[PDB]
Design a protein around this ligand. Sequence first.
Ligand SMILES: CCCCCCCCO[C@@H]1O[C@H](CO)[C@@H](O)[C@H](O)[C@H]1O
Ligand SMILES: CCCCCCCCO[C@@H]1O[C@H](CO)[C@@H](O)[C@H](O)[C@H]1O
Ligand SMILES: CCCCCCCCO[C@@H]1O[C@H](CO)[C@@H](O)[C@H](O)[C@H]1O
Ligand SMILES: CCCCCCCCO[C@@H]1O[C@H](CO)[C@@H](O)[C@H](O)[C@H]1O
Ligand SMILES: CCCCCCCCO[C@@H]1O[C@H](CO)[C@@H](O)[C@H](O)[C@H]1O
Ligand SMILES: CCCCCCCCO[C@@H]1O[C@H](CO)[C@@H](O)[C@H](O)[C@H]1O
Ligand SMILES: CCCCCCCCO[C@@H]1O[C@H](CO)[C@@H](O)[C@H](O)[C@H]1O
Ligand SMILES: CCCCCCCCO[C@@H]1O[C@H](CO)[C@@H](O)[C@H](O)[C@H]1O
Ligand SMILES: CCCCCCCCO[C@@H]1O[C@H](CO)[C@@H](O)[C@H](O)[C@H]1O
Ligand SMILES: CCCCCCCCO[C@@H]1O[C@H](CO)[C@@H](O)[C@H](O)[C@H]1O
Ligand SMILES: CCCCCCCCO[C@@H]1O[C@H](CO)[C@@H](O)[C@H](O)[C@H]1O
Ligand SMILES: CCCCCCCCO[C@@H]1O[C@H](CO)[C@@H](O)[C@H](O)[C@H]1O
Ligand SMILES: CCCCCCCCO[C@@H]1O[C@H](CO)[C@@H](O)[C@H](O)[C@H]1O
Ligand SMILES: CCCCCCCCO[C@@H]1O[C@H](CO)[C@@H](O)[C@H](O)[C@H]1O
Ligand SMILES: CCCCCCCCO[C@@H]1O[C@H](CO)[C@@H](O)[C@H](O)[C@H]1O
Ligand SMILES: CCCCCCCCO[C@@H]1O[C@H](CO)[C@@H](O)[C@H](O)[C@H]1O
Ligand SMILES: CCCCCCCCO[C@@H]1O[C@H](CO)[C@@H](O)[C@H](O)[C@H]1O
Ligand SMILES: CCCCCCCCO[C@@H]1O[C@H](CO)[C@@H](O)[C@H](O)[C@H]1O
Ligand SMILES: CCCCCCCCO[C@@H]1O[C@H](CO)[C@@H](O)[C@H](O)[C@H]1O
Ligand SMILES: CCCCCCCCO[C@@H]1O[C@H](CO)[C@@H](O)[C@H](O)[C@H]1O
Lengths: 240, 240, 240, 236, 236, 241
Amino acid sequence: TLSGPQYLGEGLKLMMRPGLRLFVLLPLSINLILFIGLIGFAINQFSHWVDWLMPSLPEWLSFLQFILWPLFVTLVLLIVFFTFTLIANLIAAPFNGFLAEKVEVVVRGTDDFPAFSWAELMAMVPRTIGRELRKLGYFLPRAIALFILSLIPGLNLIAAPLWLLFGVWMMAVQYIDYPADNHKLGWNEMLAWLRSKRWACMGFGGITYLVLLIPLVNLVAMPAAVAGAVLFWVREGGDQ
Amino acid sequence: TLSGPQYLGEGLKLMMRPGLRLFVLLPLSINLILFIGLIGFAINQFSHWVDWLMPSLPEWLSFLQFILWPLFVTLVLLIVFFTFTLIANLIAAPFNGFLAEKVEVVVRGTDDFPAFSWAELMAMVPRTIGRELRKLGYFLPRAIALFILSLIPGLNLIAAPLWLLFGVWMMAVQYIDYPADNHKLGWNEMLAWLRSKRWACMGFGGITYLVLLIPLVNLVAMPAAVAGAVLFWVREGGDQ
Amino acid sequence: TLSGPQYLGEGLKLMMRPGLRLFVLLPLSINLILFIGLIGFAINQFSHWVDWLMPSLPEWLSFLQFILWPLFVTLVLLIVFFTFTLIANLIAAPFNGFLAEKVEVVVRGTDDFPAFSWAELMAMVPRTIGRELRKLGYFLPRAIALFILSLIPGLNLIAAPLWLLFGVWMMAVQYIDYPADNHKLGWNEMLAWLRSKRWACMGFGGITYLVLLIPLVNLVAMPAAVAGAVLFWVREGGDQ
Amino acid sequence: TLSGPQYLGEGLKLMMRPGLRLFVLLPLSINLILFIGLIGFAINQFSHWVDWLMPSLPEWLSFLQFILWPLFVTLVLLIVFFTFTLIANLIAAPFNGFLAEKVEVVVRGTDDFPAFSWAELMAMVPRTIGRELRKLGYFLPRAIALFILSLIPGLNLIAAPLWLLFGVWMMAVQYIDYPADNHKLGWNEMLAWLRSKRWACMGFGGITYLVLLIPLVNLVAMPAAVAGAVLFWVRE
Amino acid sequence: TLSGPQYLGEGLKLMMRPGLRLFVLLPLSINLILFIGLIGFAINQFSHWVDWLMPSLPEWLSFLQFILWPLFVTLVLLIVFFTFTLIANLIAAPFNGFLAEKVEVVVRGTDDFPAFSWAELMAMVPRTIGRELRKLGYFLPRAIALFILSLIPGLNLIAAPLWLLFGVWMMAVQYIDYPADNHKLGWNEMLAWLRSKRWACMGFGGITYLVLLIPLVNLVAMPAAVAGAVLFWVRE
Amino acid sequence: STLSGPQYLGEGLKLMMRPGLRLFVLLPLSINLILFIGLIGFAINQFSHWVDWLMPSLPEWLSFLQFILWPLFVTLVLLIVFFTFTLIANLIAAPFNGFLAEKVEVVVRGTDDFPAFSWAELMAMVPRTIGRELRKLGYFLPRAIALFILSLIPGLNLIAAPLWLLFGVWMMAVQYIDYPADNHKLGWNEMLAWLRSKRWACMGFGGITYLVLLIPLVNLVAMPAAVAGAVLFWVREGGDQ
Ligand SMILES: CCCCCCCCO[C@@H]1O[C@H](CO)[C@@H](O)[C@H](O)[C@H]1O
Ligand SMILES: CCCCCCCCO[C@@H]1O[C@H](CO)[C@@H](O)[C@H](O)[C@H]1O
Ligand SMILES: CCCCCCCCO[C@@H]1O[C@H](CO)[C@@H](O)[C@H](O)[C@H]1O
Ligand SMILES: CCCCCCCCO[C@@H]1O[C@H](CO)[C@@H](O)[C@H](O)[C@H]1O
Ligand SMILES: CCCCCCCCO[C@@H]1O[C@H](CO)[C@@H](O)[C@H](O)[C@H]1O
Ligand SMILES: CCCCCCCCO[C@@H]1O[C@H](CO)[C@@H](O)[C@H](O)[C@H]1O
Ligand SMILES: CCCCCCCCO[C@@H]1O[C@H](CO)[C@@H](O)[C@H](O)[C@H]1O
Ligand SMILES: CCCCCCCCO[C@@H]1O[C@H](CO)[C@@H](O)[C@H](O)[C@H]1O
Ligand SMILES: CCCCCCCCO[C@@H]1O[C@H](CO)[C@@H](O)[C@H](O)[C@H]1O
Ligand SMILES: CCCCCCCCO[C@@H]1O[C@H](CO)[C@@H](O)[C@H](O)[C@H]1O
Ligand SMILES: CCCCCCCCO[C@@H]1O[C@H](CO)[C@@H](O)[C@H](O)[C@H]1O
Ligand SMILES: CCCCCCCCO[C@@H]1O[C@H](CO)[C@@H](O)[C@H](O)[C@H]1O
Ligand SMILES: CCCCCCCCO[C@@H]1O[C@H](CO)[C@@H](O)[C@H](O)[C@H]1O
Ligand SMILES: CCCCCCCCO[C@@H]1O[C@H](CO)[C@@H](O)[C@H](O)[C@H]1O
Ligand SMILES: CCCCCCCCO[C@@H]1O[C@H](CO)[C@@H](O)[C@H](O)[C@H]1O
Ligand SMILES: CCCCCCCCO[C@@H]1O[C@H](CO)[C@@H](O)[C@H](O)[C@H]1O
Ligand SMILES: CCCCCCCCO[C@@H]1O[C@H](CO)[C@@H](O)[C@H](O)[C@H]1O
Ligand SMILES: CCCCCCCCO[C@@H]1O[C@H](CO)[C@@H](O)[C@H](O)[C@H]1O
Ligand SMILES: CCCCCCCCO[C@@H]1O[C@H](CO)[C@@H](O)[C@H](O)[C@H]1O
Ligand SMILES: CCCCCCCCO[C@@H]1O[C@H](CO)[C@@H](O)[C@H](O)[C@H]1O
């Protein structure tokens, strides 16, 4: 009855109520620390990194340095961004998993005020980081496939839609995974599960993608998305 | 003999001969009268309608009115336009049906000079208005669907071609129905009928679409699209 | 002697050195709190806002509520975004201003390690906030002008360049004022004085804007722009 | 007095009152007849025209006919439009002029119910047809100029604004003329009269442009623009 | 182990070795002689073609010849180019096959080098020219179709990819045909063959497409494509 | 005298068509042939290597970037190869154009309707005419890079497209109308002043010359036509100093 994007909205509701409300701070804080620590580092090495990527040129081709400069400078940033993002989700991987349990007990009425402890969090770290690596393995190859498909002057027009649709579906697997993996469910079994809910989890993943495009709101958005995903897992069925 | 778009042309021929020659003036004359009557009222009401759609705003945001004015003024115009066409087509519905019948008797040779009588027209009105409503009910949801699909950044590129192709298929169903409905044929039965004749009525629909973009020529073109569709019905199966 | 976009570069150096590094953490924490506070506010009021703007309609026009809904949701979003920006800048105004003085004493050689104190910061707040209000009062009119010029289908092509040319100039008056305002210097007087350094401060503002197009940069760049602007005030004319 | 375009708006008020707008239905009904005639004609001869325009080609180049077919067809269509747009406006020239007088007596209070008689219309025809022909002469060179400039890849960017600004300015000279021409004023004297105040005509013609973009509303926007122009002639 | 676009590279290698390096010169010589004569021809007759294709208009409509001018000029140019491109490749058709055979024997170790003889080339000419005429018969209708498809306002977006995919596929059928036609390969069986090998021959055809986008490098790239197509024929 | 505008290029094509000047049309093509035939092989063998030079060395983790970085440098390299080639070819065409311009002049002035080609005087021209094309490049490439950097700015590109076009036309005037002018020991600055006084005429000439040189197979006939047309522009409009 709740199928579609409605879950996301409801997930936000689940985050606003006390005792789950303070867990919302986790992603931002991660990205905060990771930013502040890394930013300074990046600041010092930015100049050096481009100097490594740029080839040595003779005096006659030295003019190419003017055209090649903006490139690697862009590329470095593109790397520094992606690298950071890559780490952020990794450090955010356990917390989200830990959250997906704590949301669930509230969804079913078991304990409306779940408690945070580092013990069970550190105990979750390996399966949930490894699971973040499985997600990365499922995503990144297909991403490079669609992107190289888009670099072709003829074929990009079919790549833009495939890109979008895939990114939505990935919003389904990324977040609905957290309760599925917390129920020790196989990767294949969960992807088949989402394949059976493809319309529902495509709507959920879709509005999740959209609301996750808002830059500052990303950080309040993700916890809502996790909780909404847990709700998805409870309202669709955890039989597998 | 004629398969493909050729029917439209032949429809023109049929409308050129005496006795069917004046009905070409029915659509044009309708849109004249309709406009002449409505324009007046519209002029007075237009100003008010936008003020209604425009939100009531506080002092600091009042500058937004300067930017919201064009949008709402645009929107109302669009609505004011569609309504017009929507009403016009409705009023054009029976006259078309009455033509598709009267063209048919000429195509099959029963009466070389059919007469116009308001009696059987008014007798037609409720059913034919009902069918134009069934057509709008078929079209408007799929149209909206395509449009929402166009506002999606990734999927818009797949939205344009689908819009064209559907608008063509719709040109088949709008006009080939007039004789089919005159023959008391089920809606789904005609849609499957045309789905088996996909190519033929997709060609007829195609040229009918193109020619009916030409702005004022529409009102002379349409009766040709009717007669042409009656020909599509006569020269191809009347079987049910 | 020392000139061009290099100021920004040099300004960055001043921020990295022992004694001036932690001041960069002042705006971020603010933007954190300001975000954390406002975002929750937005979360709760969002419905009421989009419902306020939306007009009350009769039953048959109720379908319009579907087209007006995304619109207002966007509009509200934009307000929420711009309002945030507007507030953020304002709160950033004194921390910027307070910095422009503290950078200065480091540039001159009195004290290599300045200390932060809430007393004189709070003593600065009203003057500097009123200052940046003078800035918004100088900027927002010319901005609205160029924007009404760009809405005209014909003139919009000359609006894009005219936009950029002003945006670079603005970069000068925003930052270079911070030390000047600490020296009790008049608004129109500073406008006249910088009207002479137009080229230098336009290079400063040029690299300032471009370098401000990157997201990572901004959080570390505004301090670099403030320090570089202080440096610009010291090595060139402080005369009055 | 009335800043920017209010004249058009005020002009529309004038047209909506009974007595000043049955006059609107006159040229429209004619252009209807014109429309019906020209369309039927083109129906009969469209094939003759495209076969005339198409060159005779060999069997190896016969497939070229397949690319030439859409072309002349387009071309014929275009001519057919412009001819009509040209003729209709031509036929519209006197009625508008005849209206511009009949508007003025209502503006100044002379006669609240103007009388329509074919006599004084036919008497206007030569002067007002000549006058609209002068307007076509002022317009077409600068229009072709901007179109050719707009074909240029680099300079096309300067052709789009110059197009709009001209298309707006022209809306002044056509309409604000109808009263001036009724006052027996020289062409050059009127262009100096309009260039005397650029902003005013620029707003009047500006909204008149935008409002003449609305598809069926043209038919009511034009009369408004005439009377507003009459109003524009009287108040200033 | 060698599948994919690598064949292109390898074909290049085969053409670098002595005795096969003389085979590179002929397509260049064809484009050269043919080009020089046909271009001198083009300059004198151009005026007659554009004047021939352009229709007779009355003197009022005379101005239309100004818009039709850039068009027909363009059109003639396109014909001029296509005709050249049409003829050019025809004359290269047998030299290709005659080359293809001489490459195959090098792949299997049969021949270190063969002295060219006009005899066997002339013996090939009618069959292989009939073969490339059949290639034109497969190609040109799909192209005109895709072009009419690109004229459609909605479907033009689906025309852009459809072109490329076919342009690549054609580059498979064009070159991999030449060894096939050396073996009297029946038309249906080769098209099915390349349809069963879609990935390999489509990558081969792909790099062939792209490297053939390079203008003067076309001339050295085509022999590499022929050699690569023979290797594609032998190893799979 | 009445011949002002872009008509010069047409008339120049006419001059190249009459006997005595007709085979000089083959001077550019042959050049572009030879320069290609010599270079082509070299380039191919070393193309693979050049991209590998410009491409950065990346670790195990950043190796995937090679999939996106590869096509880039390959294009970049190609571009350079093209520009450099077109650079070099134009240099070799510099004396021939000048020589042709000189020879065209005697046909235009009715002195010798069938001028003879001799390697003596062409080789005599080489140093002057090359140096003068180096000056042409010096006038062009800085201003061109300026327009390109200006087009890189997000706000100002819209003003970079027209400026680019107009400057390209103007450079057509400078390049071709210079050829007769250099033959009469005319200074660089003073010819820029003279063309600046003929800006309407030579800007039309440079306009059609530009367009005709955009068509690839046609440009081989048009380049001589542009030289001759430029000689006629020099003859019919003051060659005075
Ligand atoms: C756009 C730049 C945003 C701030 C982060 C990178 C700033 C790098 O800045 C530079 O760092 C170099 C060492 O890496 C020093 O040599 C320079 O003096 C310093 O200006
Ligand atoms: C403000 C920054 C917004 C960028 C949002 C882009 C969303 C990309 O998508 C994400 O890429 C990540 C790796 O980078 C993976 O961890 C995720 O599984 C994948 O969904
Ligand atoms: C991660 C933050 C996600 C916010 C997703 C919000 C989805 C909101 O959903 C909207 O909220 C309103 C609630 O009153 C409803 O009236 C609307 O009909 C509903 O679409
Ligand atoms: C474009 C001109 C449209 C004409 C407006 C309507 C018909 C003439 O206008 C008015 O219409 C009224 C009813 O609306 C009639 O009662 C009046 O007799 C009338 O003059
Ligand atoms: C273009 C000039 C005006 C076109 C018609 C204006 C409509 C006039 O007004 C309309 O008709 C009656 C008066 O005529 C009024 O009483 C009606 O209330 C109004 O709807
Ligand atoms: C869809 C047709 C509407 C576009 C034409 C112009 C509408 C402008 O409507 C304005 O409303 C005013 C309010 O009374 C009236 O004085 C006039 O009707 C007019 O000035
Ligand atoms: C293109 C930029 C804005 C053009 C001017 C918009 C003026 C908006 O002003 C509007 O005028 C209307 C009456 O004329 C009123 O109904 C509105 O309430 C008022 O906001
Ligand atoms: C596209 C048209 C915009 C929708 C708004 C239509 C007007 C809705 O507003 C309506 O206006 C009427 C007349 O003023 C009033 O009688 C009604 O009380 C009011 O509901
Ligand atoms: C004042 C009444 C509201 C505005 C009327 C909009 C009527 C538009 O009507 C449409 O105009 C098209 C051209 O635009 C024609 O091609 C169509 O045949 C016609 O249905
Ligand atoms: C940019 C900030 C986006 C805010 C999206 C907020 C959507 C959630 O909204 C919140 O949840 C309720 C539903 O339970 C809504 O009715 C109210 O807006 C609010 O309480
Ligand atoms: C097609 C564009 C329609 C815009 C309609 C604007 C008319 C709004 O309404 C009118 O605005 C006038 C100002 O011109 C005022 O003088 C009138 O009192 C007012 O009724
Ligand atoms: C095809 C039908 C054409 C209709 C043309 C209507 C001509 C207008 O008719 C005029 O109307 C005036 C009041 O408006 C009266 O004052 C005039 O005496 C009358 O001639
Ligand atoms: C369908 C609604 C009425 C149809 C009749 C309109 C006849 C056209 O009318 C004419 O059209 C020309 C070009 O659009 C205009 O320039 C003329 O002023 C106009 O009189
Ligand atoms: C450029 C192709 C040929 C010209 C086509 C446009 C013909 C119609 O053009 C219009 O006719 C009116 C007559 O009054 C003029 O006043 C208008 O300004 C003019 O645009
Ligand atoms: C083959 C014949 C094609 C000629 C069709 C006549 C088109 C006249 O159509 C007119 O176009 C105008 C815009 O220019 C619209 O604003 C008018 O409402 C409409 O009447
Ligand atoms: C249609 C009349 C002009 C000829 C159009 C085709 C242009 C050239 O077409 C080419 O022909 C070559 C062989 O000639 C083939 O190798 C290519 O696959 C093909 O693209
Ligand atoms: C209306 C007829 C349209 C025919 C267009 C076909 C023109 C041939 O297009 C061909 O495509 C090849 C790659 O695909 C290129 O290598 C050739 O240069 C080329 O001329
Ligand atoms: C690179 C080698 C140059 C050969 C190309 C043409 C140069 C010679 O050109 C020829 O010179 C003859 C007399 O010498 C003239 O009579 C010919 O008309 C002329 O065409
Ligand atoms: C960004 C668009 C690039 C188009 C292709 C390269 C155009 C510039 O090309 C250059 O023009 C110069 C001036 O005459 C010549 O000196 C150079 O030889 C030539 O390479
Ligand atoms: C050494 C291999 C590099 C290849 C560079 C060749 C680029 C050739 O360039 C082409 O040459 C023709 C004249 O020669 C011109 O007609 C074309 O405009 C041009 O694109």
